[PDB]
Amino acid sequence: FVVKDIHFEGLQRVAVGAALLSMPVRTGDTVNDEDISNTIRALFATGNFEDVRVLRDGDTLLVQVKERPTIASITFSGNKSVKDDMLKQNLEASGVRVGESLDRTTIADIEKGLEDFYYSVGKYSASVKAVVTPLPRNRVDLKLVFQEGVSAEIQQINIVGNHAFTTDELISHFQLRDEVPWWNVVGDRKYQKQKLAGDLETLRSYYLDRGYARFNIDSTQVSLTPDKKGIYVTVNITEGDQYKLSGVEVSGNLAGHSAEIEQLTKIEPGELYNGTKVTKMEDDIKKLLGRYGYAYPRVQSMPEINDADKTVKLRVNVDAGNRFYVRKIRFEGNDTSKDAVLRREMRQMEGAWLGSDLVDQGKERLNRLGFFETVDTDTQRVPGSPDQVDVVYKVKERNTGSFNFGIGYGTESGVSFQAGVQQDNWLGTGYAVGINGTKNDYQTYAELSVTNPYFTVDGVSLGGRLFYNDFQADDADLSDYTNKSYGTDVTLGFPINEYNSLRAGLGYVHNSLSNMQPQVAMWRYLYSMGEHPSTSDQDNSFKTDDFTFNYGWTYNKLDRGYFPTDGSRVNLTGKVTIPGSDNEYYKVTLDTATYVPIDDDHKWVVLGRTRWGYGDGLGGKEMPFYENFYAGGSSTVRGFQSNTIGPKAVYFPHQASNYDPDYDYECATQDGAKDLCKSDDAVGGNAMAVASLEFITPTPFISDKYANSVRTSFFWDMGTVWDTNWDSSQYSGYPDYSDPSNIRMSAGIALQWMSPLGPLVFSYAQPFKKYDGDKAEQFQFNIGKT
Amino acid sequence: RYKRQVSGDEAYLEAAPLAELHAPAGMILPVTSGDYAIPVTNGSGAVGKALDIRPPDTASLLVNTLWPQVVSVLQAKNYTITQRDDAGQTLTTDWVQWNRLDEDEQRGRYQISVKPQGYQQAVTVKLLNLEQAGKPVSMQRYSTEMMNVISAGL
Amino acid sequence: VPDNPPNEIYATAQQKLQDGNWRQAITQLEALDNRYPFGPYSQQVQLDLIYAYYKNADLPLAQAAIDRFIRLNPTHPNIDYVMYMRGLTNMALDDSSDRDPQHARAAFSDFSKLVRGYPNSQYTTDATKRLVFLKDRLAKYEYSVAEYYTERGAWVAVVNRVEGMLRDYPDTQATRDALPLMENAYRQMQMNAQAEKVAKIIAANSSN
Amino acid sequence: RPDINQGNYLTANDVSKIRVGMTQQQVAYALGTPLMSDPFGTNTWFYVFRQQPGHEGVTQQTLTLTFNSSGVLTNIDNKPALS
Amino acid sequence: DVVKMSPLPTVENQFTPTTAWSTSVGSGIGNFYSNLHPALADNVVYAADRAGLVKALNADDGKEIWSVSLAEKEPALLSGGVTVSGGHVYIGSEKAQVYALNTSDGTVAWQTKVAGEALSRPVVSDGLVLIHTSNGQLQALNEADGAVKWTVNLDMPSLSLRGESAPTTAFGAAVVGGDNGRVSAVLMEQGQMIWQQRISQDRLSDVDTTPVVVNGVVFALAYNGNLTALDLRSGQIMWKRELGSVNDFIVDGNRIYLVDQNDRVMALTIDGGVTLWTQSDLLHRLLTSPVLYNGNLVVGDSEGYLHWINVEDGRFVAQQKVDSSGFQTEPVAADGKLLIQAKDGTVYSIT
């Protein structure tokens, strides 16, 4: 059979020339039964057609088609918990959008589709239905009607098989939760497979770390209340007895590094089997096989068990893979952030041997920038090479600007408002620019800041900061003055270590003192500067312009940021003034915090904080009183009122600036003051030492299901402040404020957890060793950031 | 986002002109790939901002043998002839049923006339009645269907 | 949108395209095309709509419409226009140079298809002017990744990168500026036999 | 700052398996494909085994393989460190 | 939310129901979907609460005989109905514990560990007690000592409904529903499987409970699967009717009465499963399993009403509120006494 010409029935949207461009059969061809079947299913594979019939006229071979209906609109009904536009976006992604055609054989898959989304967020009674209304000119108008129903919540997380540990105390470390107190953010009661998955891993590790080497998970069951509003999960476990590690035999393609791998699998026998201590050396081996070129070194450990001794012999098998080479590291998706910004985070080098782990390191290095919604990594074999390979990163960029209101409430600050606007990836340069504001009882602080996190390629940062602080000493429990400062800082930050940071920078400050109630300490400083103001009239002013070289060192080896349980944080930070400044001083402060645990589950840890500060003038001038050190309060010596510890003002007789009875003043000639006057209100010193010792304990009364969520301390706090230029000789009647031997001490209990209002710290302290002047404050607290 | 509404309008570009590198003697330049290789398509066409980018009942056909060859395909296609006036060169057909492949079926009676029109001969098919699913009612669709069936016979 | 006759809706939307207010010319074209998605004047409303989407910087909607046009009318007289247009929309998304060139070589690929297939296009003289820009633009991309790796000290990566620039984009400005980086990489790995070779190449060629 | 690795990995043992008069398909099998060849006329293979750990200084060994017009190993030139 | 609950039917009562007595047993079940019902055996009610409390009550007045708590010191998580047989009260716990307490004083006669959570009403036959655990393990414990005699291993879907099938015994074989959608038939001797017939119709699946057998045919329901009649011998399907539930049904005369998963009660003929009357006025009111009490269907609902349905047309005979905590566990119509336990543990008797 030869075709003289080809004719078309039922072509509407599809151009004759498009259908004609799709067919194997051509004009003037000798076609048989199998050739026409091969174009019938070519036309079908176009996806423009509902039914294709290709049959023979005499001369002509004619094509009958029914074109799939063209969507006229997509509308959404009863879709409460998901917004029309976002859900219209997912439909376009999957191939259903206005102007494109609908195959009527997927309208069910469409519902089953986004209805299956609802099951993911636990609306198990959800029901989405497509009604596809026909219109003239072969169009449809599909509306998806939704019945979201009610979200289902976990009624119970039961464990069965557990004898050595109570069900409740195991659930303690679970992400999925069956009970969430009103006053505690332990998580939602909402189900996800991902949560259960990592939770069965938390359960498996928990056991293996305690030497349960033959611990298996026999089965997991997620049941479902008929009404579909309640979810019951049950793990069934066999927790075979404890086992000490006998030895470890390494057996596979070691690439003749058998020498160094016995150093990685050295163990002191008798030591209990430990699942993470096992994974450590599976990764130590896999790391130095990586160190010798190999992409995907596989290590797999199989505990060989002997019940006579009750020992386990670790049979580790390892076969180093092949070597491969990265020819290109591509980045697709970065449509706003420049290539260097995400390239400089890579630990895999281009034009070098790949490490399966170095490309993984380089992925979450991009996630922790927080510049990308998603970060997916693909490793392709470069065509026609046995070992060369491309590594591409597929990023989805997110809006990285933000406004952030903060409200907090503490006994040191009252309400504190944080508020600022922030852009972390300025025009996709990795540049952080932001305007930030702080405001409590005693100070308001506004700053503008630009940072380059990679001044140099190795990630030393160069800071940049205009600030404005406005301080009211009265509202901070101090001898009343007011500082209205402003200036500029530029600081390099050098990383030297995963655990150590350095920073060095210069900075101008313009202090502007006024409203100073005359005292001898504040005055002897002003006489250092050469300024000689009225000793009787608290309408005064002093304006310094300082230039300061600032340095600092921070060490952080805290095993975890929240509820630290092991290792130390240490922060040293110093100031000294380059000559040409009005003032001539230096200052150094050192903070220490050391956690050592005393049990294996890390539920009893002792903590040693120490806070040291020292400063003094250089050219016979003094250190300003506005740079003084303070002590006492919830942050330092708990039980004492904020800044109460140290030297107290001794006032002059002066005239109060706006006098008003029914208002107490301190040495106003208006109340018959003749000579100098002792006081309660503190001024602080240029030399401070505080040191506490908390004893972190399990919290004793609430459920072990969420007990780990709250941390009880018992603390013994000590501290002193003093000033060294205090003329003890000249002020013989008054106490010796140059004597540091005056150590204040307090004991009490502290609670700490995360509530709906934010993170709490309740300190209830009791000052048993308190000196005259020192003001007590036994109950202190903090809600949010303060 | 806002950066796109300033490309999409008019902005122009005169980037560094291309120039072939000369190879020193005693060596050659790497082999040219050919992927990013601009052909020299000549002509004076307007370049950017001067370039107009705005986008640019009855069916009759023309073709002794003529008339008897028309009544012949209608007889071989199994359409009943109602009124056959060979003299006036105009016939009437009974209700012809079509298929195509869409919705519910359309059915019509026609008037096929063949009379000379200058140096050629015309075949004029007029759709008399059009009853779809027993409901007289698209108009060009089924006049051209009948005109196509006689045209394929020719 | 109203439901007037199509004749006056096309008239309405035409005099909204002539006033350069595309937001309303779209909402009437969209309605006309959704209601009459085939017909003899159906292609004209589809062209006007991809023009409107483009000038209102609705570039995803413009691409989605251009690709559906080319799928259903690959032999239509004015697919030289439709192709020229998907070149512009892709070159708009580019927005140039150190960011993802996926939109640039998409643009390039299309402008190449325009000139190979329709060398006598009214849009071909302008098109060739555009993929002369796009060439050294995605040469500039390779230059910047070469430039990063020379700061990193990844000499193997930088010579492999500029070797690729000589291969893919030899007649560009970016590759002239790139050669001294190759020469450096060689010298840094004490492969100064090879450095001396690329040293001869820069010494024998314009910076222009 | 991290460890910089560049070029091909060379065991001192896989450079035994290479000897003069081998094809490119045999050396490529013995050593893997090289990260860099010469793109300027001459058909040479550069195996640069460069590594540079943090604040320690580079150790590079440069194995340079020259092939004939046929594509068979003519000259093998290597050196274990830099000067 | 919840897509449409039905309003309380308004009906004129052809008699007047009254709470003859009531007695509290701890806090009860609460909002924890459980099988735990009361057990009537020898003019003495046996009830229990989830925490472990179990009480023996006098069937006429509801006055306590013995109370004793099985919670050690941790709650006992008692779930597995109550069944008395051979001077023993059987309680399955969700701590994979099965208790058998002496009927006389309430001492622990024995206690056994089991393959998993003992959700099922313990069924006692052939000198063995049948437990269907929550892992699809179906175990047979000796009623004398409590030692596990055999352990059949039913398969389990990715996701089930909470609750397992209580088997019935006939001719020394046990017939369980499963969470697969498969009724199974096992020998009481060693747990040798005879036949296993599927009656099940993204995620669609179908737990079962409690098949009943009358003269060589076995009836079963699957949740969202069919009500079927199977050949006792072959396992062979004889008829399917397309309607599914989770709560027991009851066969009497040549009629089946059951409550759909949408809480519409029906009477079908056992010969073909063709509907006689349907009443859809209790729809989505979270009804319990039905029981026959002097020619009247009695069903409790979640709001703590129990409605009496005429067995001849499906129209209501009497309505009554009796507890506000709610109903969900099965009533017990036996020995001319009607008993029901509400969620808060309160055991009522109804005349």
Summed up:
By secondary structure, chain A is mainly beta. Chain A has 11 helices and 38 strands.
Characterization of the model:
The complex is a heteropentamer of chains A (about 775), B (about 150), C (about 210), D (about 80) and E (about 350). Chain B has helices at about 65-75, 140-154; strands at about 60, 80-85, 90-95, 110-115, 120-130. Chain B is built from two helices and five strands; from the N terminus they run βαββββα. Chain B has a domain at about 60-155: Alpha-D-Glucose-1,6-Bisphosphate, Chain A, domain 4 (2-Layer Sandwich), CATH 3.30.530. The relative contact order of chain B is 0.16. A five-stranded antiparallel sheet of chain B has the order 1-5-4-3-2, with helices on one face. The longest helix of chain B has 15 residues, at about 140-155. The radius of gyration of chain B is 32 Å and the shape is elongated. Chain C has one domain (about 1-210). Chain C has helices at about 5-15, 20-35, 40-55, 60-70, 80-95, 100-115, 125-150, 155-170, 175-190, 190-205. In chain C, helix 3 packs parallel to helix 5. Chain D has one domain. The relative contact order of chain D is 0.26. By secondary structure, chain D is mostly beta strands. Chain D has one helix and five strands; from the N terminus they run βαββββ. Chain D is elongated. Chain D starts with a strand and ends in a 6-residue tail after the last strand. In chain E, the strands form eight sheets. Chain E has a four-stranded antiparallel sheet, with no helix packed on it. Chains in contact: A-B, A-C, A-D, A-E, B-C, B-D, C-D. At the C-D interface, helix 8 and helix 10 of C face strand 1 and strand 3 of D. Chain A: Pfam families: Omp85, POTRA. Chain A: Its main location: membrane.
Anisotropy-based shape of chain B: elongated
Rounded radius of gyration of chain B (Å): 32 Å
Determine the fraction of residues in helical runs of chain D and give it as a percent range.
under 10%
Strand order of the largest sheet of chain B: 1-5-4-3-2
Spell out the helices and strands of chain D N to C.
EHEEEE
Question: What structural class do the secondary elements of chain B suggest?
Answer: alpha+beta
The helicity of chain B comes to 10-25%
Strand content of chain B: 15-25%
Please, how many helices of chain B? Answer: 2
SS summary, helix count of chain D: 1
What structural class do you assign from the helix and strand content of chain D? mainly beta
Largest contact between protein chains? B-C, 41 and 62 residues
CATH architecture descriptor text of the domain at 58-153 in chain B: 2-Layer Sandwich
State the separation between the terminal residues of chain D, measured CA to CA: 24 Å
Which term fits the overall shape of chain D? elongated
First CA to last CA of chain B: what distance? 60 Å
Protein name (chain D): Outer membrane protein assembly factor BamE
GO molecular function, one term (chain D): protein-macromolecule adaptor activity
Subcellular location (chain D): Cell outer membrane
Main location (chain D): membrane
